[PDB]
Amino acid sequence: ETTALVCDNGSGLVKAGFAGDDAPRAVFPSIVGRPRHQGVMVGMGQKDSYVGDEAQSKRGILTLKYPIEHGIITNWDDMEKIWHHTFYNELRVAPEEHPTLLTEAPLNPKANREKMTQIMFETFNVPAMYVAIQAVLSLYASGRTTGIVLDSGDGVTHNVPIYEGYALPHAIMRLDLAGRDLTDYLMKILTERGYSFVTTAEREIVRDIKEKLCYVALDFENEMATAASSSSLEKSYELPDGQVITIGNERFRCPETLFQPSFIGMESAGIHETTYNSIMKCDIDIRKDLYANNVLSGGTTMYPGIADRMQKEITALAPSTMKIKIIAPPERKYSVWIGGSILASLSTFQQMWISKQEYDEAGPSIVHRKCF
Amino acid sequence: ETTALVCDNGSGLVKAGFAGDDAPRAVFPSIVGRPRHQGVMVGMGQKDSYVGDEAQSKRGILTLKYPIEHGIITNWDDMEKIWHHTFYNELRVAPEEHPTLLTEAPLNPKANREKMTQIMFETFNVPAMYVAIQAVLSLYASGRTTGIVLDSGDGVTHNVPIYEGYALPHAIMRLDLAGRDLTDYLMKILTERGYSFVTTAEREIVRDIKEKLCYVALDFENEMATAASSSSLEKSYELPDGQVITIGNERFRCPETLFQPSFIGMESAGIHETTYNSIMKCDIDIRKDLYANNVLSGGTTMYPGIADRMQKEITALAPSTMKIKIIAPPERKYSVWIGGSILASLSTFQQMWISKQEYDEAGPSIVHRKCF
Amino acid sequence: ETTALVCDNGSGLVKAGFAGDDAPRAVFPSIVGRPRHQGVMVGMGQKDSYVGDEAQSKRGILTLKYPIEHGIITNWDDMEKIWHHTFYNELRVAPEEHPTLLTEAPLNPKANREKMTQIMFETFNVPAMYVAIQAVLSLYASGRTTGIVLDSGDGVTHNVPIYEGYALPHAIMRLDLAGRDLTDYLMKILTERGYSFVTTAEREIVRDIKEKLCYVALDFENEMATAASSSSLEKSYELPDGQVITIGNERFRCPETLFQPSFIGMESAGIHETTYNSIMKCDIDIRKDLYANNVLSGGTTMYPGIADRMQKEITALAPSTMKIKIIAPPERKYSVWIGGSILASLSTFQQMWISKQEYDEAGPSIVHRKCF
Amino acid sequence: EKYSQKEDKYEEEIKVLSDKLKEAETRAEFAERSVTKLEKSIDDLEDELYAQKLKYKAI
């Protein structure tokens, strides 16, 4: 059988690998770089652009930019350099031998679905491809065919109810606020404490801090009080150049913005609220499976203690005769990619791929007939 | 005696089974389902149509439609799927081995009698069949060959006076108002209370409510007054997704439409009135036996306290020189079916069977020479 | 005749004025809002709440909360602030001098009819009031006492068949889908095109867009094809901070949901279908007059080209032996209000007023003995 | 996860059994009440039957 590349298009880390595996084989930063100089590096082989660990390590002669922001490809030309790095550097294989499965947000722009279809087929010469919604794959990685996924990436949060592998297209909810925003917010609130960070070389350490030290409080007022009454809600972090900084209440405040969007000037409702407002669009005979199968997904859901908080919040909005229970997979950060590996290795799914001939007949638009 | 099926084709539940039994062996919903969209499930098998408890449970993909609306077969294609489900799924037997007693509504359309004859013989290849009137059977279940059957369905109420086991055609009253209508009405009057419902998944819970909580008042004004003067005429129901609703005067109002058809904008007279009228169109001599044997049948008659109401109403219209008594079977909901079983298990009925030979010669029209 | 107010309480525009006028005096947004924080404005008077055009002038300080959703008052405390704004700010008159005709949605909840009765009498001290059904009024505006009104709001569409000036309760169809829903839907389908709108400050422009640019297609497949085959079904709109956006097929798709409710996951039937069904539940004799007098009302019906579509659809469901004709008022969006004015200015209606005396004796419940 | 999927099942089974049981209980509850009702109707019919028997004996 043809080995598929499953490539999860993350807004902060790219997760990529071969199908038939139950885990990604490549994980690298979603960063693309270009020279500070008027040309190539002195006395060394020619490259016009740099990616991942090469861009992170050669940084002193580069300007760096991001290819994807808030679940949207914000520059085609840099998403291409992630793809070029993915096939030829990280997996060291010809993509033209390997069908491609691409992850996307719910309601990902159609002009974008097409530019992705076109770029894969014309430049990389892929033999076949498909594009799939993040939450739909995370449900398959949760071992269940019907349920709802709260998927919170490194840049967007969605609530996506699904019946027997199809997402319900009227009931989906979106919130631009998650891991990208969360770093910029964390950085603001640290400046406020008097640990001013103003440089993007600091922003990436603030990102790492966030991933290591943030935790979801079970009760926001009680933890806030605890930090005001005692300094036991603070953890030290030693920066790379020495200098021990102390991270305080910012730990739980940073992710608190997910429950209360008004903290950062947004008019949107919270992630638990948009869970409730999503399920109540669905039929009563299926609401039982949706409320019982609330699945957490994506990088932002890997903060400890999240389940007890989300269990609380949803039972408070939802009637006490829908069964309520949080499903948190063992490695929920990868569940989109794992579900993509499962889907790409089903025997019945091999009829679903976009072929190169159908692309030659209908242009990039074929994704709106073969995909959903 | 070759095992006959008795298929009491109800307007809300199908009741089906084998003859020589005194009870149905399958009691399931009169519902058929078809997909809402192109593509039905992912990573699993899928099919073009669904029936009964499969359509009730796999619901999220389906538009739902019915074989029978107001005792009238309204779509041949769904009556067929109910039949296909009945033989091969529910009883798991070849129909081509088993004679079929079909029940028909009093005064069912002749073009319908025929399309039913034809569909049973050509597709299912039945050896033999007979069509018997549902009321006529309900009386045989009560152990008489003289009385009136008020068969009030899940969709149609008929008053059939029977003398010597012969239905009297001139005195047959058909009244379209019973259990189907009753749900739609109940739903209306709940919206009026401010418990608005709109989705058909809600309508089927309103149906269940109706069956559980409705009761026939003995005195309509006195119970109405009681509910206006006190909240002791209200019973709580907890919906299947939490949320406790309170069902008020709607309990007795819903079925009240059976006595006063004007409440829903009809020129029809009430069930009681139609029973009285039925007896008055009948021969003078038998009217004593008909009043005295007002036999109750069908699903709509299973509301508690019906007999005392019916006893009242009928004695008020009828002379006190004629004996009046309501006969309510122990399991009057199954009276039709039970009567089919008794009849179909009779050695004398074996000569009454329309054979395939008789089919081959005269076409579907043979039904009208053998069945009256 | 003592000057009555007519307050047509729309789900998106409130329409208010004095009776004896043939046109509303004030037409303003159905919005109320409250401060985001304690301390939010300097050098000017802070308020605990803001309303309508006053709120719209300085919206940034406010969390909006909605008095009416889907033709239901979903918060009493905000419906009160619309009313306070109505009497004292916009008409600058004492309500306690002026009888009040309130309009109600067809089949409005009784607990709501009462809280409206009570709130008007106790706080505003109205001398007198009456509540009349909005559809019933829209017909009086067209100069008839026989026909069907399809009142399609800024939130709810109702089909009310009226005979002899009497609404027929059994044939009232309420369909929750119209102008409120239509904005939220429009916004979803624009995100899909890649014009993501996520903020409610954008949604109110999307609302305006909808009112200006939507049009009812005469043939849905042929217009859809036209937009797929050519970009001549697109109109530009310049947003209020520059940036020219292009609105495509969304123009006719948005309102298309009114004919096909399955597009947004509803199990309901279309507006046309509900009109046909309404007429078929009505008495046989009057159905000719109802088809012939399909009277259009409300804000959602002001999309161009509606009549030819409606004419089509209704003739296809209805026999060609019944006369069919769409009646579209010159200013059909005011029909409710205009009808209130004509009615409230009638000498015969003066005896129909619920007096304060009648209030004092029976409490809010008096509404149900005087208003049907 | 195998325990979580089974646990889930065991709750859903507990609900379904609680619900199925309660319908059997409500019906049982109804049977006891019917019996009490019939016993009362039987008493009444036996009494009428005797009273009719006296009347038949008498004439």
Add this chain to the structure above:
Amino acid sequence: EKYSQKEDKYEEEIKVLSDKLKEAETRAEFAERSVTKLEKSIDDLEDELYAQKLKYKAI
């Protein structure tokens, strides 16, 4: 640890609910037969009372 313990309880619960359902059904079914037996006796008495009415009218 909790899932094991919650599984143990739930197996016990399922077992107790299931035995309870089966018991409720057999007894409920015995009571329905009890009613059917009483009803048959109402029918006998009713007939007999009617025959007694025809005779009583006669004599």
